[PDB]
Amino acid sequence: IIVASYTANLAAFLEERITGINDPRLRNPSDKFIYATVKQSSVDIYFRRQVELSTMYRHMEKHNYESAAEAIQAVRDNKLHAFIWDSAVLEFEA
Amino acid sequence: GSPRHTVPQCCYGFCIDLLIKLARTMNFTYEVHLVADGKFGTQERVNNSNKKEWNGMMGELLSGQADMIVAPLTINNERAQYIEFSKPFKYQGLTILVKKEDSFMQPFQSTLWLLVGLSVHVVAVMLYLLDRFSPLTLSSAMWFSWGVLLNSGIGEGAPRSFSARILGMVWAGFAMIIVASYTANLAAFLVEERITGINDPRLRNPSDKFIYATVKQSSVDIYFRRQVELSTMYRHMEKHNYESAAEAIQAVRDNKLHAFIWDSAVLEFEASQKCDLVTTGELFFRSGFGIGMRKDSPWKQNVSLSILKSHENGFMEDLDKTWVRYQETLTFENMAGVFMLVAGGIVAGIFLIFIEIAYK
Amino acid sequence: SFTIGKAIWLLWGLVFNNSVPVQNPKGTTSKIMVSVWAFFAVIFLASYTANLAAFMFVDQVTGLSDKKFQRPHDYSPPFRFGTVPNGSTERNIRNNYPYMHQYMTRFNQRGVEDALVSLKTGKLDAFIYDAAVLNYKAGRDEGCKLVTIGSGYIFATTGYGIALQKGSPWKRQIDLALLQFVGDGEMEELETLWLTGICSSQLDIDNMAGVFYMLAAAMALSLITFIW
Amino acid sequence: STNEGMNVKKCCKGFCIDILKKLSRTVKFTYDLYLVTNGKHGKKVNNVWNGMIGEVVYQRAVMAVGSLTINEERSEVVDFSVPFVETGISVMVSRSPSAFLEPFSASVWVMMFVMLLIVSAIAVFVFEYFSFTIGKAIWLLWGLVFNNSVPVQNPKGTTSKIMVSVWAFFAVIFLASYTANLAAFMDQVTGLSDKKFQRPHDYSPPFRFGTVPNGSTERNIRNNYPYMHQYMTRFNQRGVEDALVSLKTGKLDAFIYDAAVLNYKAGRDEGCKLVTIGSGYIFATTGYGIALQKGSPWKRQIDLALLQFVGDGEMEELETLWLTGICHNEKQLDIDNMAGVFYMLAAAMALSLITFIW
């Protein structure tokens, strides 16, 4: 019975992020969708300007990180799922 | 159905006792005759001069063959402008009747099972012939050939397979890859019945599974034809036109239907009678059902006062007490055929064992 | 030849295909029913793996397409849901689904804060309300046990405006004032100042409970076989 | 460059022309039919309508006998008749195994046979260190792969039983991976809130989808999601025939249009290629109406004529005759896989005949 449940689990097994910029399942997150940003940033100002970034602003205020090093430490330990950040810095760090 | 067979029989029930109450309140003699067809009556065109006529009870009332329609008549636009009505005695709505209740051998196609049987027969015959031409013999050969396929454990040995072990190992892997592919594609094959109202997006464009119909040429069909924004459901119901309601009950009992528009308290009474016909908790089309009356006459007023006398007391409550209030890998229905075929195989195997004992 | 009274173990051990082989007699009697029970065990394990494949914490309410809101006869626990009495929410329900209003009319409630107290104590199962105010109240909730399931998937997701009389000349200047209020982030500044809010191989999280129940049953059977 | 034109006389047929002729039989009025020259069905651009809405609302026409969609703004500017047909919306898409031994096990097959020879050599070494495991370990090993209750000998060595147990656990996890592969081997858009229409980064090939301009479909999109209208603006197209050519050549993947009209185009399609997603289940499911002026006394007779045409099977006869039924919708058992297993079995019988004759 244990190895049959193992077989059914491997059957249910056979993707790190959906990556949707306007996906309503990503606009409205859940307890598993964890994503944060730098607290009081200009990127947060530009997200405050647009009107479809309301639920993401209400979710990223629940995990307000002080500096970017806390965000790097959070995404290193597989705690976050999205982080709006500059491109050339990530090309450097890759 | 029948060319000419009309006999005197006995009529009773709800409308008959209502007519007895009408005769008890005001004196009138009557004669109850049954209509020939089983339809309510629609505004049907006649074959000449572009004229629309009726049929059934209204076809006999306007032609002089009837005097009073005692039936659950639906008040609508076409029937109210032709004959006079009375006080509606019945207030009853419509609802949907559904059925809330795995291709193993018998629904599954029987080409490959006979193929595996003939294959293991040919394998046993050629292994017996190789046991003859070596580089209880037949009984041990059959024991090995049915113990390789057995796949659960048997107290056997190892036959002399100096030039036959390759055939045995390929047959073992062949039988296991067959049963593995069979388990895999059954689990892939076997991996939604409710309707719940007319406002359903799934039934805006039905198919061969979404089966729903109504009574042919009924007032419910007239009301659904009046709803012009329900054209596809009208197309689906006109292809499955049923004459009587008993045929609809027989079709929904024998798993030929999935939904049926019918009156609510009657289906509650049928749920009280039969446990396999239970509807949902919905109610719509609360239409008053009365008696279609004749033209200007004081006996229409006498019948209306008798119906008002039936309304002011608890006689309708007494009829509701005597009719409406009086009530009475699943391995329950899915594996019932599994149980029957396994029991038949057990009986056939026990019969073969007793024939084998009585022979030897 | 121990299959006189011990045929139960010899028949029930031919399912999980690792039993001790027992010498069958030479009359060709036991092997046929052993093969029949073996094929029955194979199709039973196939149906068991099919049931485990068809079986595939998660939320109980998916949205408007839930398998409970139409009729709770399919599932065993019942539920209840209501809105404000004689309000615009009832008309917004009746503009989309009258049957939802029919199932909601028998399960009405009185007050929104009373509905919150009924949800916390257990006198209510569901309550249809505006999602932004529920986010604001879950951000200040005592207990931190309110995560809003669904925020406009198959919902209405409408807006609010300023309704004047039919024919007012001030309506154009009010519209220009609203375009001034939107085009500088002042309305979002008010929404930020007033509205706020804070707070794989691990699928066998309930299977180990079944392992615990089967271990307790095995210890009970071992105690029964030990005392007698 | 100029507004000069000529009055070209053209003939008309179809469904709405039959409706107009039956209204001329019933209401008995002389018809003054002319095609619109302003454009498509209608879209208000700075309080200026175009098409049939621009003809009816601006007092240039009386009624709209032809097909016209219904939304909130067209219900506000004029009054429609009863909906005689259910024509909603839908999305048109493009729509343009041998065995389980050789295509699936080609690079793993050699290493599994290498592991089989290694385990057989280990079994021979254990049998010769301390009873047919001298050179005949192949039958024993590949019988213990499947474990079909084949007794061979009584294992007195602990090493042999440990190797058989480890090989049996490997066979169990290999059978689990094989059943997982068989389960993994067995529509596209299942809703308006799909992950594909919001962003094409769901999969690796990008796709495009758009609607028609100057229509009420764009207003129905903007009344629900203006960002979908923004992605349609990023994915603009030319016209209905141009989108049809783009679907035939492959320059367009999806196309949002009506429900029954794309069913008609699917039925008249050569080869039943262009097939919609389902049949229009969870879409808006709107209808068509006849728009008249607000205050027309002829509206009641047209409504009674439409109720006469629907309520006798004549409208059903028109919708059966003037619609297509060739291409239908959605056009455990396998053929080629057990055939290839039979070819490998015939090769196995050939090898057994070779080992039998020598």
Ligand SMILES: *[C@@H]1O[C@H](CO)[C@@H](O)[C@H](O)[C@H]1NC(C)=O
């Ligand atoms: C009712 O009327 C009949 C005549 O139709 C008459 O013979 C009878 O005496 C009357 N009395 C009753 C039974 O009500």
Ligand SMILES: *[C@@H]1O[C@H](CO)[C@@H](O)[C@H](O)[C@H]1NC(C)=O
């Ligand atoms: C025309 O005559 C036939 C004769 O059987 C009759 O059944 C039918 O109802 C008439 N009208 C129609 C509807 O064709």
Ligand SMILES: *[C@@H]1O[C@H](CO)[C@@H](O)[C@H](O)[C@H]1NC(C)=O
């Ligand atoms: C019955 O009809 C008569 C006229 O024939 C009328 O005078 C009387 O009021 C009616 N009511 C009764 C007694 O049912």
Ligand SMILES: *[C@@H]1O[C@H](CO)[C@@H](O)[C@H](O)[C@H]1NC(C)=O
């Ligand atoms: C709503 O209003 C009615 C009166 O129109 C009142 O009787 C009822 O109690 C109120 N409650 C509901 C059903 O919302």
Ligand SMILES: *[C@@H]1O[C@H](CO)[C@@H](O)[C@H](O)[C@H]1NC(C)=O
């Ligand atoms: C809509 O119609 C106008 C002419 O009235 C035309 O100029 C315009 O190109 C059309 N819209 C689009 C974006 O195709």
